[PDB]
Amino acid sequence: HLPPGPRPLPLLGNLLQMDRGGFLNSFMRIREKYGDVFTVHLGPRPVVMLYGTEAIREALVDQAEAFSGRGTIAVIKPVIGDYGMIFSNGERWKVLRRFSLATMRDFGMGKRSVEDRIQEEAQCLVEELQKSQGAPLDPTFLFQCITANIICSIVFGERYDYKDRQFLRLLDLFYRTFSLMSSFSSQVFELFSGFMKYFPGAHRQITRNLQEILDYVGQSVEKHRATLDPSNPRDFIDTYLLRMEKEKSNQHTEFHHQNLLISVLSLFFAGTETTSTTLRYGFLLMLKYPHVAEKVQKEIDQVIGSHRLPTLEDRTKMPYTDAVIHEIQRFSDLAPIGAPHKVTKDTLFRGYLLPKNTEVYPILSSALHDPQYFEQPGTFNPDHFLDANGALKKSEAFMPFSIGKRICLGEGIARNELFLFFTTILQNFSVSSSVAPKDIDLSPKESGIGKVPQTYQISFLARH
């Protein structure tokens, strides 16, 4: 009945078939033995893994509803639980995703206003790197600044200065937490939290970090109440507050205080740590393959020039840069073991019966590195997204934002951020570092529920 897999042991589950290389390396080895759809017991819990573009789509697209449930990540479950639009299920999920989409669009998502804020934020970024004057720097903080300011403007109603001390702290917390979430420790914790939770570990520092961020969120929510004008909501929080007051009538409403706190935390995270991390890998990749960079700048020069601000319309006439960004996303592989799903009802899949609430991991990494769709999946090559004519070549295998009903809410804003921030930085600068291109290390610094590049230093030099 469940998909096949290695026989589990009492207590240990399938620990014996696990690998110290982490979940992804482990699952890859079990797949060779049991095929594309198989079962691994994480501690006592059966989890169905789905490998390859075809298996992943057959589930998340062809039985979209059955595979639309949300599973759990043990290490963020203490603080986050199943509140907000991301880790919720059923009517709460349906209500909060719809609410969040509608609301983000009211404050600009997919419209000229957010396009302008990204342009404005890029211009702030260029001015800051000119002040550095060649000098090598670690771009982690700035890449976080520029992406967080876009979501902050939609959620908190403001952007923050690059030297704001409380902004620095929050971004430090986000970076450290995403890495901690991605560490070998969190994976071991996913197996054995019932036992490990009593002891020191990554899981504890993650609860503390998330709680410190949640304090800031609480502060911001209170201050939103004080200045709340019911006929001009400035942002996501106000809009939520207004709906909250209106629905105090219903006792089973989803719009309560906890869903607000966690809704904001969810959006704040992931708007600080996703596009930001992708970008950071992008320029490490630009350091390793400078010929790719030059070919991007040459296309910038032809389509845009060296002075006007890039626009989203410019991307449609820039297939090569677009392909490069696709390839940066395919390679950097932000969410490898995907994100935990589960089936909402008893489900028949490839002759298997998955009982209701069975966890399901769509191994997105196996789609992004699918050999039937990409000639050399382990290598960074823009040609994976170019056809013979040099036009942008789409791929069903390209699912860095996943697919189906749970598909990333921020896909649009993330694609637009990546294009505008990437294309604007290379318009004004070229990049270099002490480290020889052949010595550039592309192995992840942490690989787990997220993928994080190695730390590096980089120089932004004006190009005459």
Ligand X SMILES: OC[C@H]1O[C@@](CO)(O[C@H]2O[C@H](CO)[C@@H](O)[C@H](O)[C@H]2O)[C@@H](O)[C@@H]1O
Among 191, 334, 397, 425, binds ligand HEM (CB under 6 A): 334
Under the binding rule (CB under 6 A), the answer on residue 399 touching ligand CPZ is no
Neighbours of 247 (CB within 10 A): 14
Among 449, 452, 459, 460, binds ligand CPZ (CB under 6 A): 449
Say if residue 70 carries a ligand binding annotation: yes
Among 153, 193, 220, 274, binds ligand CPZ (CB under 6 A): 274
User: Quick check: helix, strand or coil at residue 37?
Assistant: strand
User: Quick check: helix, strand or coil at residue 341?
Assistant: strand
CB-nearer residue toward ligand X: 300 or 399: 399
User: Quick check: helix, strand or coil at residue 69?
Assistant: strand
Q: Shortest gap between Cβ of 268 and ligand CPZ (angstroms)?
A: 9
CB-nearer residue toward ligand CPZ: 77 or 105: 77
Q: Are 171 and 147 in contact (CB under 8 A)?
A: no
Select from ligand HEM, ligand X, ligand CPZ, none the partner in contact with residue 450, using the beta carbon and a kind-dependent cut-off of 5 to 8 Å: ligand CPZ
Q: Shortest gap between Cβ of 98 and ligand HEM (angstroms)?
A: 10
Spacing of C-alpha 21 from chain mean position: 22
Among 42, 76, 213, 318, binds ligand CPZ (CB under 6 A): 76
Say if residue 443 carries a ligand binding annotation: no
Q: Shortest gap between Cβ of 209 and ligand CPZ (angstroms)?
A: 11
Residue type for 437, please?
Answer: P
Q: How long is the chain?
A: 464
Q: Are 341 and 361 in contact (CB under 8 A)?
A: yes
Distances (CA, A) of 422 to 274, 295, 326, 436: 14, 13, 12, 22
Find the residue with minimal CB distance to ligand HEM. 410
Three-state SS letters, 435-450? CCHHHCCCCCCEECCC
CB-nearer residue toward ligand CPZ: 85 or 318: 85
Nearest one of 423, 418, 386 to 400, comparing CA atoms: 418
Segment contacting ligand HEM (CB under 6 A): 73-81, 281-289, 394-402, 428-436? 394-402
C-alpha to C-alpha distance for 424 and 176, rounded to whole angstroms: 27
C-alpha to C-alpha distance for 34 and 352, rounded to whole angstroms: 14
Q: Are 327 and 385 in contact (CB under 8 A)?
A: yes
Under the binding rule (CB under 6 A), the answer on residue 86 touching ligand HEM is yes
Q: Shortest gap between Cβ of 201 and ligand HEM (angstroms)?
A: 25
- Burial class from Cβ neighbours inside 10 Å (0-12, 13-18, 19+) for residue 292 reads buried
First to last CA, the chain: 66
Among 266, 276, 416, 428, binds ligand CPZ (CB under 6 A): 266
C-alpha to C-alpha distance for 268 and 94, rounded to whole angstroms: 20
Say if residue 145 carries a ligand binding annotation: no
CB-nearer residue toward ligand CPZ: 24 or 285: 24
Select from ligand HEM, ligand X, ligand CPZ, none the partner in contact with residue 332, using the beta carbon and a kind-dependent cut-off of 5 to 8 Å: none
Binding site for ligand X (CB under 6 A): 394, 396, 398-399, 401, 403, 407, 411
Where is the binding site for heme, in residues? Answer: 408
Binding site for ligand HEM (CB under 6 A): 85-86, 97, 151, 267, 270-271, 274-275, 278, 334-335, 338-339, 400-402, 406, 408-410, 413-414
Where is the binding site for heme b, in residues? Answer: 70, 93, 97, 341, 402, 406, 408
